[PDB]
Symmetry: C3
Subunit: 295 residues, 3 copies
């Protein structure tokens, strides 16, 4: 796209504020931002807020979201689809033109770990170029295992293809498959989907802790066989809904756009890889690390 | 196949009748029928009854099926495998030769949403060329959420490949991935697996309704990440068995031949896309629409 | 690998012994062994004990495993990762050099049907060349359906690619996809992952029996849509954990490394195929047979 040549829009922080007991404002941008997806490989991604996947959104069950998208792309329209919400797609997930803003309102009444993404046609193009993310909706009454959890993090799986190449997006294997982490609390890492960051700067834990991960596989195209090396999931909640409670899973199957909450214990000091167990994808980037120490 | 050149056998209605409180007769054909799978693209499909996927079959839990297959194919043998039934494959799912008929009998004692398909070797060939479908077995005591459902439809996912090309069927990506709808009540649409019909003639609903879909992914080869845009599944029953009850799923993973019953609420007027969230497949056809109006 | 040319190390029996009420010794080798994966096709596999998949391991819930790996490979390091265990990957799943041994200790406190595999980098290479298997951990209090089961077997799904070709392992479709069976009791078959053995020498059963299969899809790369032709699973336990109990499934989705316990009834004499319902994979080898007789 001629109007994207040389464009590299600096990342913009997510803006969010509560405006009622059951009402939240969220303000995001659509923007064109260079991301290093593999060492030496820059992808001029289509993004929310200059991150790919986009920034984490966390709301409460029963919150109405008043969402504003500011489109900074000079030529391409963009939009937003939150899987958390009940909405009319043809009224509420509509395009925002270049240099314009749009505001849409809709409720999040289901707890869980949901994908969000651009909904502009062709949706494959927009998701593959980087316009994906996660929204977490916290359950009103928690999970039954809350009291057991010592530490939690967010992980997101996505793929990267040949740059802006619809033939590859439709017909080709992924070039890279990658994890990212998004911050839930101050000090947590906040990273983009790349092959290396979470190997060089592992997630941190302490020996004997129960860890919870909020996970989502945003695709665009692949399923994920999510596994943490050296442990067994004690508890799994499919899509993060507390009702969908599995126990003792070695590996969690996630569809494209599929989420879960998973919990496991790290018993011994060391580095624990986190993978999709489709090992072709792992080899192409999808290995993160959890370093577990005595302190 | 030289004996299929110029062959286009008109579709034949499914014949079905109850012959006892727990016994049903079903009569199908195997036939060679031109189907428009994408605009301008005709596939000379191998079919049941001149539909691909085939006609919908609905029976009750505990029904014995007395199934007759009339083979209208001039040269290829065909057969039938219902996933609903307990049967001896080597006695009851056997070939029927060109211009012959065969009758087989077997019980359907498990409720759910089952694939059927030709079972003739090579089974890949027969399924890929179009010989697939769904049988629904209604549970004796219903689903616990029956009283909530306002409207229901059947959707089927399948792929199309290069015509009758076993190398592509085994080694290639699908050319098209498509939804079809099969009628449960008078007035419901009844369509073939194509890229366009359910976009141009969307399924219909009213604002505020709870919708149930009976879904099956017949493949041959792909899994499906089934999602309805703008809603969350309130209830999911894996394979349509009432025991396998999930809640609040954004996306349902279906294996190849996998089924479910899914229920969701449409809250607002508009058009709601239905997709597999493996967006390469969506781009290649697998997007249906649900138009939701005040009336 | 020049140092593997002409190497064909005879298979070595698994060594296992109980050494306490909650403690077991297991001794395996890593070795280079020619396996016929398809008729006329020899793969010089990287293996545990000269089998691919490796030998079956069965322990009890709460057993500590004292595992020894003797590396017979002349040049490549190997290691072992059991998905059953809680362990530090960077201390306990480490490499054993050529012509050396290493012993590692760790608990199996979760019941189920777990993958094991080499964990040496690149793990894709080691798994794809044949270093995979299953460990079963028997639940302390059984499964609720134990009293119903008449007969049981172990089945494993894996893929084979072009020989030792990392580009194919990462980017290509599988050449073959195959089932194997591993013995649980004297007289049971014990086979390698190949396209033919379980078609020519089917698993055996009697009419009216309830069969249990312990299944795992070791990959490396594919998911599996596991189905037995002519029946419906009465009961499924995901990953073999008794809590994760489904009923009446036609087909079980398994992630890569995913396991299950499945139970079904064979009602009539005949041969019942067992497949992954991703029929491209079935066509490439993944069809086993269960011959069901009056005796
Ligand atoms: Cu309130
Ligand atoms: Cu507001
Ligand atoms: Cu966009
Ligand atoms: Cu979506
Ligand atoms: Cu792929
Ligand atoms: Cu703790
Ligand atoms: Cu664990
Ligand atoms: Cu009766
Ligand atoms: Cu009859
Ligand atoms: Cu046929
Ligand atoms: Cu089948
Ligand atoms: Cu494909
Ligand atoms: Cu209603
Ligand atoms: Cu909904
Ligand atoms: Cu004891
Ligand atoms: Cu010992
Ligand atoms: Cu190895
Ligand atoms: Cu593993
Ligand atoms: Cu493949
Ligand atoms: Cu019995
Ligand atoms: Cu059955």
């Amino acid at each position: 796209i001629a109007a994207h040549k040389g464009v590299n829009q600096a990342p913009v922080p997510l803006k969010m504020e509560r405006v009622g007991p059951h009402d939240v404002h969220i303000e995001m941008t659509a923007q064109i931002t260079d991301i290093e997806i593999d060492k030496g490989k820059i992808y001029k991604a289509w993004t929310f807020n200059g991150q790919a996947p986009g920034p984490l959104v966390v709301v409460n069950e029963g919150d109405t979201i008043h969402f504003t998208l500011k489109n900074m792309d000079p030529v391409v329209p963009h939009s937003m689809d939150f899987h958390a919400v009940h909405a009319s797609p043809s009224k509420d997930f509509i395009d925002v033109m270049p240099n314009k803003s749009g505001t849409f309102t809709y409720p999040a009444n289901k707890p869980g770990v949901f994908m969000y993404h651009c909904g502009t046609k062709p949706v494959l193009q927009h998701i593959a170029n980087g316009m994906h993310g996660v929204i977490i909706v916290k359950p009103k009454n928690g999970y039954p295992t809350d009291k057991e959890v010592d530490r939690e993090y967010v992980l997101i799986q996505n793929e990267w293809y040949k740059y802006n190449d619809m033939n590859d997006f439709q017909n080709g294997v992924p070039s890279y498959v990658v994890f990212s982490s998004k911050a839930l609390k101050p000090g947590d890492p906040n990273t983009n989907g790349d092959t290396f960051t979470l190997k060089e700067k592992p997630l941190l834990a302490k020996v004997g802790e129960k860890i919870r991960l909020y996970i989502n596989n945003v695709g665009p195209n692949e399923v994920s066989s999510f596994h943490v090396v050296g442990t067994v999931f004690d508890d799994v909640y499919l899509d993060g809904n507390p009702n969908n409670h599995l126990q003792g899973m070695q590996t969690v199957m996630l569809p494209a756009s599929g989420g879960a909450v998973v919990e496991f214990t790290v018993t011994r000091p060391g580095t624990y890889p986190i993978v999709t167990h489709q090992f072709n994808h792992a080899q192409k980037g999808a290995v993160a690390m959890l370093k577990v120490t005595e302190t």
